């Protein structure tokens, strides 16, 4: 019939191809869809939902419910950090297993601003000011509030509103970052410090907890879908 | 899937409006952008969420079954001349996890069959090119008991005849769920045990229903046996197409243990890291 | 540009805020320390539309007789509490005419208004995550997969408790065949910290006393069997442990009030009497 | 000639494919069709024809003509069922071998309302009232008329009209049911009871027979054509 | 094939119209719908009978013959160097039953040939790729007596030359019935015995006529014999196309016994179940 | 959208109610207890159209001479009767000028009006299924396939009876070569309960005394040999056994009256004298 | 389906061919280009730049 | 003509003169013997455009505070000199407020004006090639690949010298981990004579006393870390050796004056204190 020439790539199976195939059940009467609540079109919609960060991965806290709580107290003011995180949303252990991290571990490249939301879970009678800081990479990781205040930061006043959002802006040399611990595409450093201190009256718990959440911003995106390392099979 | 919004320049701010302060108790995620907390320049965004779409996320062929068959002889009791495989995505973890990101799904399917065969011994001669019959057996249809019984007439059962050495076989299936969507999870039973009847009766496995009953595939080698044994494996790759999903869930964090949500091992998925260690 | 042409019939073959009042029937709830109210997936409960009705026989809609708030048994929140769970409609199977319609019909459908109440002073600490999970499947306690029996999977209004650590049921002669929901695994092999992908509200004792979740009917079918299938699961976890003035031994009640909404039932027969624990 | 690339799926034979092939008898003068009575376009047209149900599959009645007759008598009123069927039109033995069941056994999925027609084959002088009930699944199968009357049902008066149709409506959680005995897609329970009783005068047979028929409604449909288990071959 | 009707809402009824009561004696099936006997809601139907069409029902390749041929040597009397197969769908049951759902049929046909070959012994060398000749022999045409006689010139007989390893061969045939439709059943004889002639003469098999005479297929291996024997099997798959059918019949309930409607075994197809057992 | 293009010439290569009176000729039938009348496949018998005429020679249409009711031998319905069958036109081969035209011509065509009559009192029970089967092939009684001889396959107006159970003819020397139609297998390896796919009527003794079936000429050819091929088969089965007042031994007659309709004959020759049993 | 004939040159790989291939990372969000100085469209642009000649290739 | 059609979604799948004055801030340079001035790639330095801004936080632009000429340490040109190299912004890390902004911010961007000054009499000989090399990677001195340490790779304003011949560092205990730039290989395995593909100017002592190169910010990113990455490399090679009146031992100074231009910094934090040599 029609003269044809078989190019290279013939008879190959590429799992990413997009080709028409014969139907094995022709004329099947497909059940129509109903309007089910909660439809999702993009994985970034899930990445945009705040999920609690397992911040406290110490030996006795990891793999319990205590790994999500960070304990503050009413001690005297100090410049040492409350918590320190590395901005590796996919490879950092404290971030890898959040929903954002879980989605990023199916992709190779990511880019966009993040939001960290901290919720104060002390009593109504507790007051304080915290400093949540993001340092772009390149310099030494801030070991005191004096270093941390030189980077991006927010001073959080704990009052009638017990939650504060810090947006980590997209500050990268490359247009995309890798989802692995990588020096050339390192993200930066999140840290928390006491601004003044936590003050409580008498007959109040002197130790309280903060909970951490992370999510993506509307400018976030990923690409180069890959296989995750968070699931494996034996034999 | 479409383009992201641009970044607008933001100067210094001094006002009573405080986007940073919120209340997560409401269950609502604060929709802040960088310009709300820091001074920003104008960036004309060119990145897109095209590869994050639900279609792209599932647009890969994922192995879901390795079916082993033999062509040795009817006498040999250790050789399985045909193999029946219940159709499911839970024999493998990777696609199972990607799917169980969502409670409900609705999609067409593409099945690709990669067949690889080999010799098992050398001093018995050689074999001619084999033809494999893959017969789809919907629930209720007769199931072959022998590799050459009447069931393989396939007068009604769809059947694929694959010649070894040809490109991997491929078929497409519409959405064939008896419900309006596929249920990745079913929080219930197929039977309700009734007061009075014996504990033997009415007992049903938790989470098991006929929503996930799709029949099986029966794979055989159509050729008669050569004087030497030949072992073949069919690998089934499932690609969802025209995917819709509903009710996102947190992904599986611990190893799967059976068809349900049971866990038994690897319950400590997170490593140890200092609170103030970067 | 590129050109696409379909060579087959079946399309499958083609290429790829604080003060609130809620009145339902003869029941009313007033709240002054509310953290707003969440509508799950932004969908309000509704009745089946003629374009989606599978059963043909006329449904029954008890309306106010069943669409009203029922209060469940109160639980106690302590420092050692790991969390609680309930299954809907299972938690309401013994609640007025709702349970009667549930057991007299083969098919039932309903959304819900879940109101969790936990009041504490201004000198208390603690946070509760209240999560509405569609198809809240829970892990069992035996090496046998999917082995949980119906009686334990449907505790009723008491619900169940989460566990700190997983325990395996080795009793071969008389297996418990009960759930073993681990709190940090959310009872389903998923980290609890990600449970916020589900519709939820946090009761922070310094901010709010209550949570309200409007759950639409969610299912792969327009209507199903309420005795076989639990559409929703309500999970309450202590995100921040309860604490008070260092006195210790403090415990505050948590009360759950659920109102079914837009109840529809089909397939009237003799009443169903499920086997009891 | 024209550069071409051979995609995967080349050189395969799919029994469901739809491809053009060379004609082995070109220019054949095909005999024209005549108008033959009884043309069928859809298998559901056959499924819509009433066919007698082998209701009485007892040891001495099965595989005889007695398996189609259900014997009523003029005994005193009782609430025990006359006959009990499970709504599994393809897998239920009493329904599997009806024409509806035979067609359904070539398909995997089915959906729609059914009609059961019962014909009274007693004498003209016999009178009675029966209750034909359909119970959607989930509850205990009705063991007495008191349970059965709570489900869908029809009270049939045996008079000048000796036939009664009960429509089993489509009441399913799933948009389709399977054609196998399956718990998640179970159909329900058909049952028959005496409403009052069968009354005859003297010099009349005190035992009569009813015949059962089943068919599909115009809203019935099937899909996912498969191979049936009702025919097999040896050697 | 087209969409089903919608379901209309039905309220309570109190009238002298009784759709439920009927009389099956008329031979007419009562065309009731759920709204006639029970109260119904409005359902916008989206299901269709597209896969129940007569075309879909028969739109599968069904194996109808397994023809065995050999390539060993002319001397070997135990090797069949060519095989003649009368064309029929009654050597297999599944397609036969699907077809005998109807008394008359009229359709084009698609024949697909899947050829599989193998060695029979090892210590005799190896073979080169084989070419198979499948010659259609219409009734009256000369039938080969040897694998290499003049008949295989195929000056007029259609012939297919298939190279082993190529995709399964395929041809299409128009409706080639001498009548206006194919007769699945023929309640008659080819001869009428006449009074006077001996009982030997005029005797014809019941139900056999020349309506179902379609000739045969002669299959051979065109290659000369290698020093080793090679056994090949051609599987013939028949797919009706452009199907029209008339006069539906109840499907075969008991095992087929020969080309006719005879039955001898398995006359008890139905199991035992209680009258009042659900 | 998808694109389809044919690359071949031959299209085969392309991808896929109670009171009634019936008057025919000089015969008339009156019925008062009729269950209406069925027209098989909704097609009334008709003459061959010029667009479908295979034979070229002028047909003969005896009209009233042959298109009239002939009454066959009456059979007796007892409690033990399994059913009866007749073959058309075979049952009318000795009926007036119809049989004469049938045997004088090589080709014949006719539809039929079949009227089954079975009257019983209001104190009788029983139902008869009367089925018109196109190509009513019946199973033989020997291990040899298709071995039934012409004489037995064409019994005439007496027809044959169905059997309760299958019996195998082992007489090798003098085989019976007769049919063995099993009642519950409908004589053709198909369940009798599905026989209602064929055109049919039920005579329920409490409702009607008679059945009427208008059979069009059905065949894969426009016209065929009536001596070789039986176009139709009339099968009568007791669906409900006959019963009466517990007296027992009751038996009521069943009479069959068949009128050929639109008779056409072609190929006049000397008369055919078939071999007799 | 459509009758086709496989010409010679089928199933070959020519390193100079120009054919479409399936994408292994579909829907990837490609990083947009920025205006980098010193873009080159033709190698002759580089050949047009003066470069010093090693004229004195003596041993030392 | 030929026809092209794309069968895929992703486009990747588709088929393929003498007197001059320069004033920056409070600094001014006057030249009278200039050989014009080169703008590298014809692109003048500029600020990041909103269409290309990766970081979202407001940048700081010190303008005149940092966009001004800083003079580096003078080197001496002798007959035996092989050449010198500097890295930008590394050569300016200790230069006024420019270095302060460089070390206080995570991201920095700047173009440059490089002014090389070398005055000699009319009785002197010699030519200097002054090359601006983007990503001026230099070869190390050990068998270990890419083993040069940060301290040596960033010498500062002193820069480094080219070498006549390659020497291998065999000290295993205390490796030098320094560069070994060979003059005729341009320090990167490429012939020095081809180095003129880079933006450049030649100071021929008979023609001009100075060279001026306007380097735009060149990088694969709009903005990067100045402490990690050196955007530019300034390489000076004697093309023609220095000679004078046969007196011998003559040496003339070469002075380097670099002004950063259009400085932008993002990511303010505590100051970076890099490890010193
Ligand atoms: C041609 C004969 C062999 C190939 C035909 C096999 C067809 C089987 C397709 C229907 C059953 C599988 C449908 C989809 C599978 C699971 O439900 C999905 N992974 C659910 O998420
Ligand atoms: C090219 C040579 C070998 C292949 C050509 C063989 C052509 C034979 C086709 C005509 C005979 C078969 C026609 C149809 C078969 C049966 O009559 C149908 N199954 C009847 O239902």
Swiss-Prot record, chains A, D:
Output the superkingdom of the source species.
Answer: Viruses
Q: Where in the cell is it found?
A: Virion; Host cytoplasm
Q: Which cysteines are joined by disulfide bonds?
A: none
Give the record's subunit note. Answer: Interacts with capsid protein VP0 and capsid protein VP1 to form heterotrimeric protomers. Five protomers subsequently associate to form pentamers which serve as building blocks for the capsid. Interacts with capsid protein VP4 in the mature capsid. Interacts with protein 2C; this interaction may be important for virion morphogenesis.
Functional note:
Forms an icosahedral capsid of pseudo T=3 symmetry with capsid proteins VP2 and VP3. The capsid is 300 Angstroms in diameter, composed of 60 copies of each capsid protein and enclosing the viral positive strand RNA genome.
Protein name in UniProt: Capsid protein VP3
Organism of derivation: Poliovirus type 2 (strain Lansing)
């Amino acid at each position: 019939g029609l003269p044809v020439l078989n190019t290279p790539g013939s008879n190959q199976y590429l799992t990413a191809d997009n080709y028409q195939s014969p139907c094995a059940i022709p004329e099947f009467d497909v059940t129509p869809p109903i309007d089910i609540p909660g439809e999702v079109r993009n994985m970034m919609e899930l990445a945009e939902i705040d999920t609690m960060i397992p911040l406290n991965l110490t030996n006795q806290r990891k793999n319990t419910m205590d790994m999500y709580r960070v304990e503050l107290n009413d001690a005297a003011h100090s410049d040492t950090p409350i918590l320190c995180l590395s901005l590796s949303p996919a490879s950092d252990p404290r971030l890898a297993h959040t929903m954002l991290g879980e989605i990023l571990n199916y992709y190779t490249h990511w880019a966009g601003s993040l939001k960290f939301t901290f919720l104060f879970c002390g009593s109504m009678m507790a007051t304080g000011k915290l400093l949540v800081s993001y340092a772009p990479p390149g310099a030494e990781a801030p070991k005191s509030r004096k270093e941390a205040m030189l980077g991006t930061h927010v001073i959080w006043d704990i009052g009638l509103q017990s939650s504060c959002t810090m947006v980590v802006p997209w500050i990268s040399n490359t247009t995309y970052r890798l989802t692995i611990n990588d020096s050339f595409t390192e993200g930066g450093y999140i840290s928390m410090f006491y601004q003044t201190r936590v003050v409580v009256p008498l007959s109040t718990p002197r130790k309280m907890d903060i909970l951490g959440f992370v999510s993506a911003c509307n400018d976030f995106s990923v690409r180069l879908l890959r296989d995750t390392t968070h699931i494996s099979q034996e034999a | 899937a479409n383009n992201l919004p641009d970044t607008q320049s933001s100067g210094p701010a001094h006002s009573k409006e405080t986007p940073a302060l919120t209340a997560v108790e409401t269950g609502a995620t604060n929709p802040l952008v960088p310009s709300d907390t820091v001074q920003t320049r104008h960036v004309i965004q060119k990145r897109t969420r095209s590869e994050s779409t639900v279609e792209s996320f599932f647009a890969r062929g994922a192995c879901v079954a390795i079916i082993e068959v033999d062509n040795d002889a009817p006498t040999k009791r250790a050789s399985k001349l045909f193999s029946i495989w219940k159709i499911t995505y839970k024999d493998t973890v990777q696609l199972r996890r990607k799917l169980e990101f969502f409670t409900y799904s609705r999609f067409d399917m593409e099945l690709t069959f990669v067949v690889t065969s080999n010799y098992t011994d050398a001093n018995n001669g050689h074999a001619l090119n084999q033809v494999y019959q893959i017969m789809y057996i919907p629930p209720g249809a007769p199931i072959p008991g022998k590799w050459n019984d009447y069931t393989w007439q396939t007068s009604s059962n769809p059947s694929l005849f694959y010649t070894y050495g040809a490109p991997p076989a491929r078929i497409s299936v519409p959405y064939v769920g008896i419900a309006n969507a596929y249920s990745h999870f079913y929080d219930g039973f197929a039977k309700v045990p009734l007061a009075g009847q014996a504990s033997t009766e009415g007992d049903s496995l938790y989470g098991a229903a006929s929503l996930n009953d799709f029949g099986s595939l029966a794979v055989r080698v159509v050729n008669d046996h050569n004087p030497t044994k030949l072992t073949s494996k069919i690998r089934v790759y499932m690609k969802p197409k025209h995917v819709r999903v509903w009710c996102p869930r947190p992904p599986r964090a611990v190893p799967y243990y059976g068809p349900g949500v049971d866990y038994k091992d690897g319950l400590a998925p997170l490593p140890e890291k200092g609170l103030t260690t970067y | 540009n590129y050109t696409t042409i379909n060579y087959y019939r079946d399309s499958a073959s083609n290429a790829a805020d604080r003060v609130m009042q809620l009145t339902l029937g003869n029941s009313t709830i007033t709240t002054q320390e509310a953290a707003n109210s969440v509508v799950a997936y932004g969908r309000w409960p509704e009745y089946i539309k003629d374009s989606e009705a599978n059963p043909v026989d006329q449904p029954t809609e008890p309306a106010v007789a069943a669409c009203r708030f029922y209060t469940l048994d109160t639980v106690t929140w302590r420092k050692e509490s790991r969390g609680w769970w309930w299954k809907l409609p299972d938690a309401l199977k013994d609640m007025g005419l709702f349970g009667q319609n549930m057991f007299y019909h083969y098919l039932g459908r309903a959304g819900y208004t879940v109101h969790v109440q936990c009041n504490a002073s201004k000198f208390h600490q603690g946070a509760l995550g209240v999560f509405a999970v569609p198809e809240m499947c829970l892990a069992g306690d035996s090496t046998t997969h999917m082995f949980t029996k119906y009686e334990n999977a449907n505790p009723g209004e008491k619900g169940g408790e989460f566990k700190g650590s997983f325990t395996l049921d080795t009793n071969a002669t008389n297996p418990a065949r009960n759930f073993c929901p681990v709190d940090y695994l959310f009872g389903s092999g998923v980290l609890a910290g990600n449970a916020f992908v589900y519709p939820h509200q946090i009761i922070n004792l310094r901010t709010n006393n209550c949570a309200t979740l409007v759950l639409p009917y969610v299912n792969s079918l327009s209507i199903d069997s309420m005795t076989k299938h639990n559409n929703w699961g309500i999970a309450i976890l202590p995100l921040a442990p309860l604490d008070f003035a260092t006195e210790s031994s403090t415990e505050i009640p948590i009360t759950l009030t659920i109102a079914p909404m837009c109840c529809e039932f089909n397939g009237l027969r003799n009443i169903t009497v499920p086997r009891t624990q």
